[PDB]
Design a binder for this molecule. Structure first.
Ligand SMILES: Nc1nc2c(ncn2[C@H]2C[C@H](O)[C@@H](COP(=O)(O)OP(=O)(O)OP(=O)(O)O)O2)c(=O)[nH]1
Ligand SMILES: [Mg+2]
Ligand SMILES: [Mg+2]
Length: 374
DNA sequence: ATGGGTCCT
DNA sequence: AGGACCC
């Protein structure tokens, strides 16, 4: 059965949150800085050549007028992120989060409910909200076209409510599955929306120029495909399944070749509350157990505040010089909210298991994670 | 990379 | 405990 899926993608999310917090930056080029990176910037800085994940050096030699705000503490972005997800869940309860600033909603039942409430007179009547991908002609007698247009109307109500209630702008894409909704949502940006009618689906998938542009094909898989002479979407569509299975294994080969044809039967999953929560810090050097204990403690204090459901597992992640980790359960008496001294004790034991402290060492990342929430 | 997340093997 | 993916 055919679905109607919406993908919602907030405009320059962290920069939006900082611009709302400080409107002295609303008319100025703004970048959100983490360590030496400009992780995102407003469309005003984008005009001046500043790009996402750009070295703070290169970004200011491109835009010497660039205003920088520190975005290392994710507290406020995470809080707004969940306010958006909760707002969407009011439209339809099955909302899938993808990072902090994207959501998928399955609108199929909502669409069918709205259509069922329309008298035969007003079927034609039905109008698109926003862009139609590839300027495709609408056929109002095609029930798939009608359902996708009602999806576009719902998407515009969602964007409006996000603006009215939270002060946030964003893009939306409406299509028959998640892959296609996520691909089409970014066609017109910022703060616009697009719907994909089914006869334009080939056009959308062949508009991609790099195989890594398909969501689900990442860094290592694209390296593999390139090693095999596979560069375009069509190369992948037409490559031998049997060779592809041999090279990538049956699961990945079968999944990505389907994705190459625009086919994606994966359900929208209700994300609900998070499965883990972690605090990280990166640095040039940690060369000391005395320093490492201080580092881990600060991460612990942040997480304990977030805690206040309970985690039943704790893990510690390091990066030397890639990631290594050690985890263990959290003792029952400790799950019962001075928790600090027995938890740091647990974590240093994990640290000592992974790091030989009697021999020199050099860390560039420490991360503590709470998981296995009950 | 930064500072987070998800699921699968 | 690690891999792969996503933002
Ligand atoms: N540290 C780090 N943060 C990221 C990374 N990718 C995305 N983010 C964060 C910062 C951004 O505000 C947001 C980026 O998500 P998007 O890819 O949707 O980008 P953004 O919303 O900034 O720009 P957009 O208008 O959608 O093109 O989440 C990343 O690779 N590393
Ligand atoms: Mg975004
Ligand atoms: Mg984002």
């Amino acid at each position: 059965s055919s679905r109607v899926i919406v993908h919602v993608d907030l405009d320059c999310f962290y920069a939006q949150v900082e611009m709302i917090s400080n409107p002295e930056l609303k008319d100025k080029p703004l970048g959100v800085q983490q360590k030496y990176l400009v992780v995102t910037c407003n469309y005003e800085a984008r005009k001046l050549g500043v790009k996402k994940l750009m070295n703070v050096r290169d970004a200011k030699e491109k835009c010497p007028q660039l205003v920088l705000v520190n975005g290392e503490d994710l507290t406020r972005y995470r809080e707004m992120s969940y306010k958006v997800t909760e707002l969407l869940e009011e439209f339809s309860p099955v909302v899938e989060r993808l990072g902090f600033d994207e959501n998928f909603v399955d609108l199929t039942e909502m669409v069918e409910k709205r259509l069922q409430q329309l008298q035969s007179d007003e079927l034609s009547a039905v109008t698109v909200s926003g862009h139609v991908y590839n300027n495709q002609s609408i056929n109002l007698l095609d029930v798939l076209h009608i359902r996708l247009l009602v999806g576009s109307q719902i998407a515009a109500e969602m964007r409006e409510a996000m603006y009215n209630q939270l002060g946030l702008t964003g893009c939306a894409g409406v299509a028959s599955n998640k892959l296609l909704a996520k691909l089409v949502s970014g066609v017109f940006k910022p703060n616009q929306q697009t719907v994909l009618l089914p006869e334009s689906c080939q056009h959308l998938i062949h508009s991609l120029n790099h195989i890594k542009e398909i969501p689900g094909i990442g860094y290592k898989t694209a390296k593999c495909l390139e090693a095999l002479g596979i560069n375009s979407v069509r190369d992948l569509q037409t490559f031998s399944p049997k060779i592809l299975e041999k090279e990538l294994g049956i699961s990945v080969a079968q999944r990505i070749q389907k994705l190459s044809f625009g086919e994606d039967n994966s359900p929208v999953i209700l994300s609900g509350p998070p499965q883990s929560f972690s605090e990280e810090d990166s640095f040039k050097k940690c060369s000391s157990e005395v320093e490492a204990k201080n580092k881990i403690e600060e991460l612990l204090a942040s997480l304990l505040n977030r805690v206040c459901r309970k985690p039943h597992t704790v893990r510690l992640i390091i990066r030397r010089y890639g990631r290594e980790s050690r985890q263990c359960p959290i003792p029952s008496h400790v799950i019962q909210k001075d928790v600090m001294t027995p938890m740091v004790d647990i974590l240093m034991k994990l640290f000592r298991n992974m790091v030989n402290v009697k021999m020199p060492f050099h860390l560039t990342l420490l991360s503590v994670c709470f998981c296995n929430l009950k």
